[PDB]
Amino acid sequence: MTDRFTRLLGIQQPIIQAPMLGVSTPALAAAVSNAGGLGSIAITGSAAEKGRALIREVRGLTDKPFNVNLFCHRPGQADPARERAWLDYLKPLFAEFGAEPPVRLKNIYLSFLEDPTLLPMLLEERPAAVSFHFGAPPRDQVRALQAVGIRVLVCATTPEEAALVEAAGADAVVAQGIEAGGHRGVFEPERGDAAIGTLALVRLLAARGSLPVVAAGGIMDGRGIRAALELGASAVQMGTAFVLCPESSANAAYREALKGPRAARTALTVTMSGRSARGLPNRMFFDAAAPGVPPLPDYPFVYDATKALQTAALARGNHDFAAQWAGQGAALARELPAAELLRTLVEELRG
Amino acid sequence: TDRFTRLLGIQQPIIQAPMLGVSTPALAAAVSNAGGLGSIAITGSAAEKGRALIREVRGLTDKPFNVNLFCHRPGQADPARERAWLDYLKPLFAEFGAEPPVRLKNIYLSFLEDPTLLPMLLEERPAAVSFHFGAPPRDQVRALQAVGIRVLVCATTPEEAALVEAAGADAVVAQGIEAGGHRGVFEPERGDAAIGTLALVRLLAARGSLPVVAAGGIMDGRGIRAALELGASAVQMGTAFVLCPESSANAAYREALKGPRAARTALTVTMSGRSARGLPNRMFFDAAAPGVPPLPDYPFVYDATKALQTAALARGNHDFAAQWAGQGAALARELPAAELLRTLVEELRG
Ligand SMILES: Cc1cc2nc3c(=O)[nH]c(=O)nc-3n(C[C@H](O)[C@H](O)[C@H](O)COP(=O)(O)O)c2cc1C
Ligand SMILES: Cc1cc2nc3c(=O)[nH]c(=O)nc-3n(C[C@H](O)[C@H](O)[C@H](O)COP(=O)(O)O)c2cc1C
């Protein structure tokens, strides 16, 4: 086994439990870090002070390194006319549940690039690792984090995005293949999505690049981890494998969805949030290019609209609109305390 | 594992993929003589011409080889749809001073619609017969197995791997999204799950009955080792053999795959009517874009494209060529096929 990543992070095992906004928790992160991996939390969507309190919660439960994740998308551009047309299109769905769409949509997830309170807070709290999704911060901000001993990780979905992660000065690249659950890390989705599978992406980044590569997407057991290291990865990041952990904040309907037959087929959708994301298809996965569908508002305003519909639906016992993200290996998902899943993966990695 | 090797009577768990228009009897023999499983594709040829190709392979090797056929839902003619398609293409043909064919032909008969292929295979008896786009009716997998032939079927999903199993094929070729050339989806009007090799191979090895041949993105022995770790019994590699001098890739295609265009592949349905992965060019356009008419069936669309390729090529223009390649294309190497095979085996052990 290579120590290129474990050395870097000061951990025992080359396994990262994916940050998963709405699913990871301080209990989940601490569990994995205490078992010898790198546990993770996502803090986007919170005030800096509330992210601070979440970082301190994890520190309260583990003395080991953990990872704090922030979204670094292009800041969403409000478009009130486009947003009104979208809301009008969604009216019949709200009406099914005796609800009306919201009157206005909000930028619910501020990017690291538009919230200047986040960097100073992280320079104070100094978690072991800070990770970025959807883009890379400027090199001088990455270096400010490293000057205080924080390791910086950034997700890339292509070699061209991996070149940008290198130019930002990150410590490692998270190579997110098509198999991955949740939002695709594509930097500029208006330019398309190469939709490179994990087996090819990890090989290309390890064969033709020199930052340490963390493989992310479809990995559910030790055979998958061993395959990723054979491709040249220095570590793995696994999200869907940790969703059934009892430490996770997945709800009962999501656990049921993932343990059941729907796990056999995932799909990508832009209509849930405004950005391409993979999960178990439902009534929120519709064809945005069908006749009569108006133009999609920007991320994350579309997600604000969806969350109000999810609220209205859940207020009538209906879970057909929920965000139940999941990777293409979802049918191999197991339910176990995170620290024992972690140890099971290690035994399988070495078995 | 030697699940697969013993079964096929070969030394090495490496299949050089059948690639219509790229694989040749010389390529297949080189790989078979070096210890893997060489392959040829015979769809699109009369049964007698297929027989002549099998005999060409046997002229160069007496080791096991694989003979591939397309098992797609047979194409359905729709004259008005075809006429509007050819109309839309008209200005392209015009740029090279030609115009479209008047009608379009079912240039590639599925195994399902050409009753002469099965009799022809029962006599010639290659070691393996493989099918793409679908699983043949079960009695026939039986009929080939009856006479000593191993039957392989490509699938792109666990659901399609079921349909292969019930068919009692001997092995399933698990084709990930990384794969070059035409996607093996059975029923594309029904959608495309577009599953990556890493997930598909693990799913089929953990949940299915058959030896799994991993296909898509594998370019070196590390990729081979990875596939075996995921539970595959062997690999099938197409893009890695395209640069072999034994292939029938033309010079333009070789230069395209060696150059910077290998950094990015894409899927198109506008080249043939079915989703296929290669180096994008002027045949890779958005079929849903304003002004583009409904697409005709596979393989009729390919018939129109071949016509336009013939016309561009007469003017020395290669921008409409079919230059298929997988997502590992940037790792392509140019070696004699047997030397590639030896290098892969070395890497698989190192
Ligand atoms: C439920 C879920 C939520 C996700 N949310 C985020 C997140 O908040 N931030 C992030 O960096 N990645 C997120 N991801 C993606 C993961 O970081 C990682 O790319 C992905 O889980 C890997 O694929 P796998 O799920 O097949 O393991 C999400 C993934 C899932 C499954
Ligand atoms: C140039 C080329 C032509 C292809 N044509 C066919 C074909 O005729 N028959 C078939 O079963 N598969 C065909 N394929 C698909 C391969 O069998 C296989 O799934 C693919 O090569 C695997 O990915 P790789 O190219 O990344 O190795 C072809 C692929 C390539 C690259």
Curated annotation (Swiss-Prot), chain A:
One BP annotation, GO: response to toxic substance
CDD domains found in the cross-reference section: NPD_like
Gene3D superfamilies the record matches: Aldolase class I
Knockout consequences: Deletion of this gene results in an increased sensitivity of the cells to P3N.
Stated induction or repression of this protein's expression: Expression is repressed by NmoR. Is cotranscribed with ddlA.
EC class (word): oxidoreductase
Cofactor note: Binds 1 FMN per subunit.
Keywords: Detoxification, Flavoprotein, FMN, Monooxygenase, Nucleotide-binding, Oxidoreductase
EC number assigned by the record: 1.13.12.-
InterPro entries linked: Aldolase_TIM (IPR013785), NMO (IPR004136)
Cofactor(s) required for function per UniProt: FMN
Superkingdom field: Bacteria
Function: Nitronate monooxygenase that uses molecular oxygen to catalyze the oxidative denitrification of alkyl nitronates. The toxin propionate 3-nitronate (P3N) is the best substrate (and the presumed physiological substrate), but this enzyme is also active on other primary and secondary nitronates such as propyl-1-nitronate, ethylnitronate, pentyl-1-nitronate, butyl-1-nitronate and propyl-2-nitronate. Is likely involved in the degradation of P3N, that allows P.aeruginosa PAO1 to grow on 3-nitropropionate/P3N as the sole nitrogen source.
Family: Belongs to the nitronate monooxygenase family. NMO class I subfamily.
Protein name according to UniProt: Nitronate monooxygenase
Native source organism of the sequence: Pseudomonas aeruginosa (strain ATCC 15692 / DSM 22644 / CIP 104116 / JCM 14847 / LMG 12228 / 1C / PRS 101 / PAO1)
Organism placement in taxonomy: Bacteria, Pseudomonadati, Pseudomonadota, Gammaproteobacteria, Pseudomonadales
